[PDB]
Structures are given as structure tokens and as C-alpha cells.
Amino acid sequence: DLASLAIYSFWIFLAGLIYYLQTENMREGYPLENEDGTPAANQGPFPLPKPKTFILPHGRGTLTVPGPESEDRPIALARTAVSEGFPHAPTGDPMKDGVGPASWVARRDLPELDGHGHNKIKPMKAAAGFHVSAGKNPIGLPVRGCDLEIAGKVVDIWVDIPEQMARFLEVELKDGSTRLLPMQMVKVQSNRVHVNALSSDLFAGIPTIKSPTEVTLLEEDKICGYVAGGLMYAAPKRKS
Amino acid sequence: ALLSFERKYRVPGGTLVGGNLFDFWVGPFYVGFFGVATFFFAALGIILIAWSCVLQGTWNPQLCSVYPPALEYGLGGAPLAKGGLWQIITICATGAFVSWALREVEICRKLGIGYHIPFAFAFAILAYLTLVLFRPVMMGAWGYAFPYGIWTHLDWVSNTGYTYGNFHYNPAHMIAITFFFTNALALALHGALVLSAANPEKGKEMRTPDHEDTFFRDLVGYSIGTLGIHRLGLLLSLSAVFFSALCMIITGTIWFDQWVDWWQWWVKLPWWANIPGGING
Amino acid sequence: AEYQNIFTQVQVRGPADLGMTEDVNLANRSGVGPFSTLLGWFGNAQLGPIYLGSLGVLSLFSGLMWFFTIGIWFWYQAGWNPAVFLRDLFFFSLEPPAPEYGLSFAAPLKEGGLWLIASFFMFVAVWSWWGRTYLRAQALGMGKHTAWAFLSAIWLWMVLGFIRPILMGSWSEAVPYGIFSHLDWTNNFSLVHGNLFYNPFHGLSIAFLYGSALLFAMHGATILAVSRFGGERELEQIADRGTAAERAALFWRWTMGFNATMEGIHRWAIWMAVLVTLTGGIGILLSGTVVDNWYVWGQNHG
Ligand code: BCL
Ligand code: BCL
Ligand SMILES: CC[C@H]1c2cc3[nH]c4c(c3C)C(=O)[C@H](C(=O)OC)c4c3nc(cc4[nH]c(cc(n2)[C@@H]1C)c(C(C)=O)c4C)[C@@H](C)[C@@H]3CCC(=O)OC/C=C(\C)CCC[C@H](C)CCC[C@H](C)CCCC(C)C
Ligand SMILES: CC[C@H]1c2cc3[nH]c4c(c3C)C(=O)[C@H](C(=O)OC)c4c3nc(cc4[nH]c(cc(n2)[C@@H]1C)c(C(C)=O)c4C)[C@@H](C)[C@@H]3CCC(=O)OC/C=C(\C)CCC[C@H](C)CCC[C@H](C)CCCC(C)C
Ligand SMILES: COC(C)(C)C(=O)C/C=C(\C)CC/C=C(\C)CC/C=C(\C)CCCC/C(C)=C/CC[C@H](C)CC/C=C(\C)CCC=C(C)C
Ligand SMILES: CCCCCCCCCCCC[N+](C)(C)[O-]
Ligand SMILES: CCCCCCCCCCCC[N+](C)(C)[O-]
Ligand SMILES: CCCCCCCCCCCC[N+](C)(C)[O-]
Ligand SMILES: CCCCCCCCCCCC[N+](C)(C)[O-]
Ligand SMILES: CCCCCCCCCCCC[N+](C)(C)[O-]
Ligand SMILES: CCCCCCCCCCCC[N+](C)(C)[O-]
Ligand SMILES: [Fe+3]
Ligand SMILES: [K+]
Known about the structure:
The complex is a heterotrimer of chains A (240), B (281) and C (302).
Chain A: H1 2-24, E1 52-55, E2 62-65, E3 77-79, E4 88-90, H2 94-97, E5 121-123, E6 131-134, E7 142-144, E8 150-160, E9 165-172, E10 178-182, E11 187-188, E12 193-194, H3 217-234
Parallel strand pairs in A: 7-12
Antiparallel strand pairs in A: 1-2, 3-4, 5-8, 7-8, 8-9, 9-10, 11-12
Chain B: E1 25-26, E2 29-30, H1 33-55, H2 84-110, H3 116-139, H4 152-163, H5 171-198, H6 209-220, H7 226-249, H8 264-267
Antiparallel strand pairs in B: 1-2
Chain C: E1 11-13, H1 54-77, H2 82-87, H3 113-139, H4 145-167, H5 179-192, H6 200-225, H7 234-239, H8 243-256, H9 265-286, H10 294-298
Helix pairs in contact in C: 1-3, 3-4, 4-9, 6-9
The structure holds bacteriochlorophyll A (BCL) (2 copies), bacteriopheophytin A (2 copies), speroidenone, lauryl dimethylamine-N-oxide (6 copies), fe (iii) ion (FE) and potassium ion.
PDB class: photosynthesis
Keywords: Photosynthetic reaction center, bacteriochlorophyll, Rhodobacter sphaeroides, spheroidene, ubiquinone, disulfide bond, photosynthesis
Assembly: trimeric
């Protein structure tokens, strides 16, 4: 009977599909490692997929996955028990060290480019024709940390050009230097921008970028990772 | 075993309950207090379900079923074989799903990410409780809840819907279905767009988010953006389960006749109610 | 109150983005439309430009024709009384030929010939529209995923109004145009065939429809959860994994013991959704052509 052949066939197709999908999802982070980075004995029942290669645009090279996996940075963590599967305590300031929720990745230290190969993200003051067009303009507001202290003023908005969104606030600190603050991590209120993740004292902590009018994928991750890690690590100095 | 980038994230901290007592992993699974809670609730439940399936006398998946207590029992207890086991298995499941959820809130804290996922999760927990708890408790009986049975629960859906005629006519059921269809639509389109960019014509450079935005704008004259579509797909599928809970919560309480008749209020509007012509006048 | 990125705080607008060019024929692109501050709170604010070539005009025309054909009949059924039109708006129905006319085109205008004309315009609209989702992707160098995914939804729509009626030897089997009528047609078909809950492909189709809601909730929650790390920029996180990708992978790893990649999650996606109508159209196509009563078929295959 035709119907029952079809439904039997389908289930076989579906298992192959799940297998296909689950391998395709192993192109990154595999093969599994022990807590010292050696290959792990039990790799599960799925095999690594054949390597695929992406042709990155704008002469940025390729990516081939799966490939050799390497953290490409030192990790300031240390075992907390004598057996696998336990937390790993930081060995310094996890905020300063980029471990934990403060963690960042060793992404390319170039900036993301739009499709015409200009930097994806610019400050507004240097983005012709860009301006705030709805909602409170945060530029000029005092930036308040979670200890309810003022930590800086907003001196620009860093905007994505091909998408036209806000992506960071640029905050000027008491020493006159700025930092970038991810937009998704401040509350623009009518008299202030509030940052619940960091306390004021921790604002100079924020990794600093090297050029004033661009930010690289690496510099983003150290800035985003740091602010977010403040959530867990500032908490001794978060009020209410 | 860890992932080739996992160790740096496996720091302590983030728990909601009990400090560092349960703050460890088991294989890839993070545990926590609410990992244990989950396991208890989920284990006790699954136990009672296989032992409810000897009190019924059946060891088949296509036949094992744990029916609620009979309408006659109203809202009280009931013997284990006559509805009591369902009532327990139901508390278990609640505990397991709320545990799975708070366990997720801990995993969120330790990773410095936002609580969007177990908040999305809440809508599914809430729809479930709507069917097994909230709705039965305004209608006055656990017997208006559905059984725990692969095929018997489907019966209940047919039996329940047809009490009110063709259930299509439920206006909130309608809006639910519309979000569900739009979600699958947004899902297909989303997956493909990302994918046709990472995986272009042969030998071509990766396409950029610009190329996605261009594609849809070229095609439907709008493009919602890469942040929007994730906002959308969350909103569309949350919305659908909201109106699912709603469509069922109003059914049997504030509306209990044939859903097709609910629509007279429009047809019987006075400025056109007795105009001749068309189907109704 | 912590910000959750569900709605925008500060909208910024630059000059109009007219889009990548590649091999697209720019002669056929409209100008930029208005800028909706409204939309900008959830998504993008810029409407337009749209591409409209020959194939688009054909499709955009047939569709209006199918909509208008239905619509004229709807005015008629209202006796041209605008008030009745609104009142009975969900009750009108353009209906297919009666079974005596079989698959033929002879049936009178007001007894099915109109349904067959409206259906023609729909056929030409949908299909030429499919050609659009291909040619637009080809034009930019991108893949044809969007097009193959469409082809899955086309497949259900094709089985409901074309393939099953022809296999079943009569236009009468096909779906009418109308709000309530199409609804009753559905619930009917289910009764004629033994309660479709007994159809393994209805059950499967449902699973994916549920699973599409589960997944897109899951996915969209996760990408908003890691948007504080640039998560939403999925293409460059694919070329160059970020902490966003890493923590999103590791949320679902530490929850359900396995996880996805930033590129992998979108193959999960495209298939969970595509299988909704894929299995769905098989369950219909078998119904009445091969299986008369799913219940009864389940009694002898289960
Ligand atoms: C005779 C049939 C009637 C009918 C009667 C009903 C009835 C009766 C109901 C619906 C409801 C629904 N119907 Mg209706 N409906 C009909 C026709 C349709 C048609 C159609 C094309 O005809 C469609 C598309 C729908 C669509 C739908 C949705 C709006 C909704 C289902 C989603 C939902 O509730 O999710 C909610 C999702 C959940 C509750 C899942 C919760 C998951 C929990 C939290 C976790 C469980 C974990 C699990 C145990 C884990 C296992 C272990 C692990 C796998 C390892 N109906 C016809 C007319 N419909 C339902 C509804 O709205 O319910 C609220 C409902 O009760
Ligand atoms: C009481 C009635 C019956 C019943 C009878 C049927 C029948 C009959 C069918 C379904 C179908 C479906 N049912 Mg059922 N169903 C019932 C109960 C349910 C319940 C439930 C809780 O009880 C649920 C969750 C569902 C769920 C589902 C879906 C999974 C499935 C449709 C997938 C889809 O997206 O189609 C929506 C997608 C489409 C229709 C494709 C459309 C594609 C075209 C190309 C779009 C053209 C647009 C056009 C040009 C206009 C453009 C608009 C302008 C842009 C404005 N059913 C009961 C058992 N159900 C289908 C199926 O596969 O069954 C096997 C089906 O045909
Ligand atoms: C709100 C939008 C959609 C949604 C979202 C959603 N679901 C989620 C999440 C989110 C955001 C998770 O984080 C979580 C998850 O891990 O996903 C991978 C989950 C999840 N949603 C799931 C299921 C599910 N979601 C569904 C629906 C949806 N989920 C919505 C459409 C459906 C249906 C019917 O459409 C199902 C089946 C699980 C995969 C998972 C939750 C895992 C969990 O709770 O684990 C703890 C419990 C156990 C391991 C077992 C408990 C066993 C019980 C104690 C006894 C059984 C009780 C039960 C009542 C019997 C049911 C009988 C059936 C035959 C009818
Ligand atoms: C995986 C399956 C899911 C899916 C996939 C899917 N659908 C798709 C695609 C994909 C991948 C496309 O490529 C294509 C698209 O372009 O989407 C943006 C499409 C599409 N899915 C559509 C609809 C649709 N998809 C649906 C379902 C789903 N599609 C599935 C759940 C449904 C249902 C029944 O649930 C509908 C109604 C369209 C938006 C589009 C196909 C467009 C098409 O064929 O257009 C030809 C017709 C015209 C160009 C003109 C039509 C006239 C209109 C009535 C408008 C004009 C009249 C009036 C001015 C306004 C009308 C509306 C009311 C206010 C009156
Ligand atoms: C305000 O009034 C005016 C006049 C301005 C209007 O325009 C009013 C307009 C309306 C009131 C229209 C409102 C529209 C509707 C209610 C339509 C509702 C539509 C549906 C419910 C869709 C139902 C599903 C339809 C299906 C399944 C169709 C299948 C189509 C076929 C696949 C096409 C097959 C081709 C055929 C039969 C023709 C054969 C010939 C060939 C050459 C191929
Ligand atoms: C129903 C959707 C979920 C299907 C489960 C697919 C298999 C996931 C298990 C992957 C294996 C995990 N592992 C061992 C590689 O780490
Ligand atoms: C689904 C959303 C549809 C939006 C369609 C908008 C098309 C924009 C056309 C604008 C035309 C511009 N101009 C000046 C040439 O007319
Ligand atoms: C699919 C498009 C959705 C558009 C919905 C627009 C909702 C408006 C809510 C904006 C919130 C306003 N405010 C002041 C909080 O920013
Ligand atoms: C533009 C439509 C293309 C032709 C296909 C439509 C078939 C309609 C048949 C109408 C029947 C006419 N008549 C007199 C026999 O009733
Ligand atoms: C791509 C993700 C795969 C998930 C598969 C969903 C499994 C659902 C199986 C339910 C059983 C349905 N049926 C028809 C046999 O009754
Ligand atoms: C397909 C529906 C039910 C599937 C049940 C859940 C699958 C288990 C996936 C968890 C995998 C954990 N593990 C073993 C890889 O470590
Ligand atoms: Fe995505
Ligand atoms: K400017």
C-alpha cells in the first residue's frame, strides 16, 4: 500500500536529515576536548563533516571548517577540584582577564566592512547624513553606573551604516578619554543613560580601541565581553 | 568533554539557590539546584506514568494513558487509579517545567546573557497550565483537562473542539493560527536568507547583510533588518501561543455555545441587519 | 529596569540605502519609499526600493486579477449593496465547478467558470512570483534557498487546488475562495476522510508547525539574548565566531546536552519550516486518491 510505503520512506529520510544536520553543526568547536585541551576519548556517535571553505569578501581570505581549533589567547583559569566537571576559578581579575561572562574571543583585529568594503560601524560625527531620528538623543547625557555614580558623558553615537542602527555609545570619562558601551547594555532615560552592568570605578576598565573612528571585531569583543561580565562581577557594588 | 572554546566560560557563580553546592556540570549538562529539582520532578513523574500503566494494565506507547479524574470528582482528590495519578503526574510536570526554566535562568547568569530564552519558555509553560490547570479550575473539574496519552490526547482535542462546533470559528483560535502560519513563514524565509548569503553561487564571495537587505527590498519592497527578524520570530511565535492560551481560556467559561454563532453580533448590527440581499439579509 | 532589545531606544537615519548592485538590472528598480518611524521601533524604517521587472508586473497583475475576480462576485453576491458587502463579507464564496462538470471548463460562469478564471490568475501569480524569488537571488550572486523553500509552500497550495482535484477527476474537490467557506471546506475534508488526526502526515506536519514555533522562539530569544555581543550579525559571526556565537552555543549545550553553530541553526530552521508543508501536502495528496479513511487505514497500518 502506497501510503504506508511513503510514511516508512519518510522516517528513513528524516533520520538521514537529522544526521546530516547534526554533523553540519559540528563545523565549529569540535573535536571535543578534555579540560586540559587534549582530544577527548568519547566524541559521541557523529562524525566530523567534510571540510567546507568560505570565500570571505574584500580579500579577507577564507575560513575552512571544520579545522584546527585554537583559543589563540591565554585563559586565566584554574581547576577547583581533582576530577572533571567542576568550575574553574579565575586566577586574577576575571574582568581584566576576559574569563567567565567577562570572556572575549580572538576575532580578527580588523573591522567589519559593509558590502562596498567601507567600515560597517562609524561614529556619527563622521557619518555623513546620519543623525538621531526618533526617541531621546542620548548624546550629551551623563552616564550613571550601577553604584549610582556618574561615570562619563555621551559624546557620540557609534552607528551601523548599512543597517542604520545605534551600536555603541561613546562615553567620555573624567580623564578625558572615551570608551564604547554596547547600545543593548544601556538604558537611555530622559535625564541620564544608566548602565546597570558596570559601577563607575569600573568604567576605565573597559578595553579601549586603537583608532578613534573605527573599531575592530576584536575590540568589539573585548568591550562587549567586559561590560557583560560586569553584570556578575560588579554585583558587590550594585545597589538596589 | 568540553568544546574547543568552552573552558573559559565554566567559571563559578550565577546560581539562584544554594551557592556552589550543585554548581558543577555532568557531561555537557550544567546541573545547579534546579537541575536536581528537574531531575526529581521529571523522574518521579516518568516513574508514576509507567506504574500508572500497570494500574491501567498496558505497557504499549500507543496505549499507555493516564486519564484525569472523572468530572464527577470535580476538583478534589481521587484514587490513584481513578485520577489521582494524573493529578500527581501533573504537579510533577509543573515542577519539572518551572525547574527547567529557572535552571535556564542560572545558565543565563553564568554566561552574562539575557533572560530572553526562559522568558520565551514561560509562554509554553503557561499554555500548558492553561489547559491542565487554569481552564479546569474555572470550569470546576480536572476532568476537563486532557489525558497523558500519545493518541488519547488527540481524541480530547477533537472531542473538546467539536463541543463548540467547528472550532475554526473561535476568533482567538483564528488569530493564533494566523501567527503560527506567519511564524513558519518567517522561519522559512529567515533560514533561507542567511543561508543563501553564506552559501552563494559557486566560487563566489560570501554575501553581506547588505546583500540580504537588497534581496528582500528587491523582492517585497521592504526588508525588516537582521535585528528585526529575530525580534519578529520571537514575537510571532510567542504571540501564537498567547492567543492559543486565550482561545482556550475563553472557551467553556465566557463563551460556551457554538463558536460559529458568535459572529451574529456583526451580521445583526442594526444599521444593516435587515437590509435585504446577500447570504444573511 | 534592564533593557531587553525588544524595541529600539534611539533611531538613527542616514541617506537612503539603494542596495547592492552585483548583476541586478538597475533599470528595473524603483525609487526609495517613505521612512516609517513607526517600523523603526521594531525593525528597519526604510521602505523601498522595490525591483519590478517584466516578471514582477505579470505576477503583480495576475494577483490583482484573482483578487478582483473573487471581489466582483462578492459585490454581486451582495447585490451591489455596499452595506451588505461589509456585513456578509466573510460569508461570500466563489465556488469551484460542480462534480458533473468533472475536470472540464464547460461549467457556466456563475457556476464555477468564475472560480476557474480566478484560479488561473492565482496560478500565474504564484508561479511567476516564484520566478521572482529565483531571479532576484541569481541577480545578486546568492543561493536559491528562498526559492526552494517557497517551492515547499507552493507544493501544498498546488496539491489543494490542482494536483489532487485532477487526480480525483474533478474541480469540485478544490478549495473555494472565501473566508468562512474555505474554513468549512477544511473541517469538511477532515470528516470525509475519517478524521485527519489518523493521517500520519497530518500528525507530522503539525509536529513541524509546533516545532517551527519552538525553534523560532528558541532562536530569536537566543540571538536577542546574545545581542549585547553583536550576536544578530550572523553572517560575520559565521566567518569569524564571536563570544556571542560561543555563549549561544553553550547555552543550549549546558541545557539539553547539544547545540548548533551560527550557520547550522539556519539549516535546522529552513527544514523545520519547510517540512511543515512538505509532509502536509503528502497527507492531502494521498487523501481520497489512495486512502479513503485514515482511521480505517490506521487499523491496518500502525
Ligand atoms: C477538532 C479539532 C479542532 C480544534 C480544536 C482545538 C483544541 C481543542 C485546542 C486547539 C488548539 C490549537 N489549535 Mg485548533 N482545532 C482545529 C483546527 C486547527 C487548525 C486547522 C488547520 O484546522 C490549526 C492550524 C489549529 C491550530 C491550533 C493552535 C492555535 C493551538 C495549538 C498550539 C498550542 O496550543 O500550543 C500550546 C503548546 C503547549 C501547551 C506545549 C507545552 C510544552 C510544555 C511546557 C513542555 C513539555 C515538555 C515535554 C514533556 C518534554 C518531553 C521530554 C523531552 C522531549 C526530552 N487548529 C479543529 C477545528 N484547537 C489548542 C490550544 O489553543 O491550546 C492552548 C487546544 O487546546
Ligand atoms: C477540523 C479540521 C481538521 C483539520 C483539517 C486539515 C486539512 C484538511 C488540512 C490541514 C492542514 C494543516 N493542519 Mg490540520 N485539521 C485539524 C486540526 C489541526 C490542529 C489541531 C490543534 O487540532 C493543528 C495544529 C493543525 C495543523 C495543521 C497544519 C500543520 C497543516 C497546514 C500547514 C500550513 O501551514 O498550511 C498553510 C500553508 C498553505 C495553505 C500554503 C499556501 C501557499 C501559497 C503559495 C500561498 C499563496 C498566497 C496567495 C498568493 C495570497 C497572497 C496574500 C497577499 C500577499 C496579501 N490541524 C482537524 C483535524 N488540516 C493541511 C495538511 O497538510 O493536512 C495534511 C490541510 O490541507
Ligand atoms: C512558547 C513558544 C514555543 C515553545 C518555546 C520553548 N520551548 C522550550 C523552550 C522554549 C523557549 C526551552 O528553553 C525548552 C528547551 O529546552 O527547548 C530546547 C523548551 C522545551 N519545550 C519542549 C516541548 C514542547 N514545546 C512545545 C511548544 C512550544 N515551545 C511553543 C510553541 C511543544 C508543543 C506541543 O508544540 C512541545 C512538545 C521541550 C523540548 C523543552 C522543555 C524540556 C523540559 O521541560 O524538561 C523538563 C522535563 C522533562 C525532561 C520530562 C518531564 C516528564 C513529566 C514530569 C511527565 C510528563 C508530563 C506530561 C504532561 C505528559 C505529556 C503527554 C503527551 C503524550 C501528550
Ligand atoms: C515553509 C512553509 C511556509 C511558507 C513559506 C514561504 N512562503 C513564501 C515564501 C516562502 C519561503 C516565498 O518565497 C514567498 C515570499 O515572497 O514571501 C515573502 C511566499 C509567500 N507566501 C505568501 C503567503 C502565504 N504563505 C503561507 C504559508 C507559508 N509559506 C508556510 C507556513 C500562507 C498561509 C496560507 O499560511 C500564506 C497566505 C505570500 C506572502 C508569498 C507568495 C506571493 C505570491 O504568490 O504573490 C503572487 C500574488 C501577487 C503578486 C498579488 C496578490 C494580490 C494580493 C491579494 C494583494 C493585493 C490586494 C490588496 C491591495 C491587499 C490584500 C490583503 C488584505 C488587506 C485584503
Ligand atoms: C472592495 O471590493 C473590491 C472589488 C475592490 C475588491 O477587490 C474586493 C476583494 C475581495 C473581497 C477579495 C477577498 C478575497 C478572498 C476572500 C479570497 C480568500 C482566499 C482563500 C481563502 C484561499 C483559499 C485556498 C485556495 C487554493 C488552495 C487554491 C489553489 C489554486 C490552484 C493551485 C490554482 C490551479 C489552477 C486552476 C484550477 C486553473 C486551471 C487552468 C490552468 C491553465 C492551470
Ligand atoms: C529532535 C531534534 C533533536 C535531535 C537530536 C539530534 C542529536 C543531538 C546529539 C548530538 C550529539 C552531542 N554530542 C555527543 C556530539 O555532543
Ligand atoms: C510588505 C511591505 C511592502 C512595501 C512596498 C513598498 C514599495 C516602495 C515603492 C516606493 C516607490 C518610490 N517612488 C518614488 C519611485 O515612487
Ligand atoms: C511588525 C512591525 C511592528 C511595529 C510596532 C511598533 C510598536 C511601537 C512601540 C515603540 C515603543 C515606544 N518607545 C517609547 C518605548 O520607544
Ligand atoms: C484568462 C483565462 C484563461 C482561460 C482559462 C479559463 C477557463 C474559463 C472557462 C470559462 C467558461 C465559459 N463558458 C461559456 C463555457 O462558461
Ligand atoms: C528537523 C527536526 C526534526 C523533529 C522531528 C519531529 C518528530 C515528531 C514525531 C511525532 C509522531 C507523528 N506521528 C505522525 C507518527 O504520529
Ligand atoms: C526526538 C524527540 C525526543 C528526543 C529526546 C531528546 C534527545 C536527547 C538529546 C540530548 C543529548 C545529550 N547527549 C547525550 C548528547 O549528551
Ligand atoms: Fe538567525
Ligand atoms: K553625521
